[PDB]
A paper describes a structure:
Here, a rational surface-engineering approach is presented that involves mutating protein surface residues that are distant from the peptide-binding ERK2 docking groove to alanines. These ERK2 surface mutations decrease the chance of ‘unwanted’ crystal packing of ERK2 and the approach led to the structure determination of ERK2 in complex with new docking peptides.
Parallel to our trials with pepMKK2, we attempted to crystallize ERK2 with two other peptides (pepRSK1 and pepRSK1_SQAA). PepRSK1_SQAA is a mutated version of pepRSK1 in which intra-peptide hydrogen-bond stapling interactions were removed by replacing a serine and a glutamine residue by alanines. In order to grow complex crystals with RSK1 peptides, we used the same sparse-matrix screens that were also used for pepMNK1 and pepMKK2. Surface mutations allowed ERK2 to crystallize with diverse packings and some of them were compatible with docking-peptide binding.
Numbering used by the authors:
A (entry chain A): 11 to 178, 186 to 359
B (entry chain B): 712 to 727
Amino acid sequence: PEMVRGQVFDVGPRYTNLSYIGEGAYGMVCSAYDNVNKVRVAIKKISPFEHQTYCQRTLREIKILLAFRHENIIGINDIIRAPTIEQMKDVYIVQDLMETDLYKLLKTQHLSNDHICYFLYQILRGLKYIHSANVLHRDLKPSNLLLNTTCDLKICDFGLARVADPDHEYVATRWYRAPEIMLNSKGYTKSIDIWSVGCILAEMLSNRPIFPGKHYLDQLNHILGILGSPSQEDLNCIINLKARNYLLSLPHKNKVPWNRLFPNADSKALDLLDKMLTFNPHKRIEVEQALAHPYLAQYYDPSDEPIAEAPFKFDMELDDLPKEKLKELIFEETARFQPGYR
Amino acid sequence: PQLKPIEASILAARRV
Ligand SMILES: Nc1ncnc2c1ncn2[C@@H]1O[C@H](COP(=O)(O)OP(=O)(O)NP(=O)(O)O)[C@@H](O)[C@H]1O
């Protein structure tokens, strides 16, 4: 088989010419050539079987991506793994090849207001479909927005996605986490994705993350430094009046108007930004509302903005199964890409 | 990395 940076990529003979693209903790991503279909694809080797959390993440991403059909959401073209459970040590997910992501792009490229507007419409368009299935993505951030030079945007990486439930784990970055998650919320509400989207928008507008905290309390300090100290009702809407004490310990800070940051931004983008980054999740703009905001009027089209057929449902609680069970589920979930499955 | 116009996208295309 082919070896990429010292690792087996056992995807032949159908897939060949693997070129390394990128890396995460238990997964590597390569470009490749599909000789059966004669297209360039992306292949993710994922080796999650050592840890429960990775297993559960992998199963969520698989089930959701196979259940969703949307222009603005990455799909899964094929999945390769061994023919017995004992041999299965890795899983390869074949996806459409995208050219870059928003994170890698913003590194080297000032966006124009036109691109910003159109990228945001695309995110929210994908998100509408997501939320309409009653799914929360929960990890929206630039590195999860895949793009082409044609300016198509696809949302990827649903390892932390769940079914919304107000109200009867965690993450690389807190940078795009809604304030309520540090306070009183499990992030089981659709408002958390909206906050992430606002964070993303702010980052396209200025090429830098708006709230780059280094740890839990610092993340809050960044957020409040812009949004200003919260109102007593935004307070004690709390499910926790004992981290609220911590809030009280902080000096009052004023709301730094959005035109002082982002002085050149379009007034309508800034206005939509204000509505997406509101401290109170209940006062926070929803996906349909945001799509309908005047900033996105040119692209706004309910008739060409698809909605899920039904709510998604897991059927088993994944968080709570041992990795052995989860491995077995992963095996049965991928059997449909095996030759001779019935 | 350098972006072509919006008008390239097929989604954007069905906006005309
Ligand atoms: N289908 C794809 N087409 C092109 N690039 C992709 C694709 N899927 C993932 N990537 C890229 O692969 C790299 C990271 O993949 P990934 O394994 O998901 O990283 P991670 O640590 O798992 N998730 P993230 O924190 O969002 O980077 C990035 O450079 C992405 O741009």
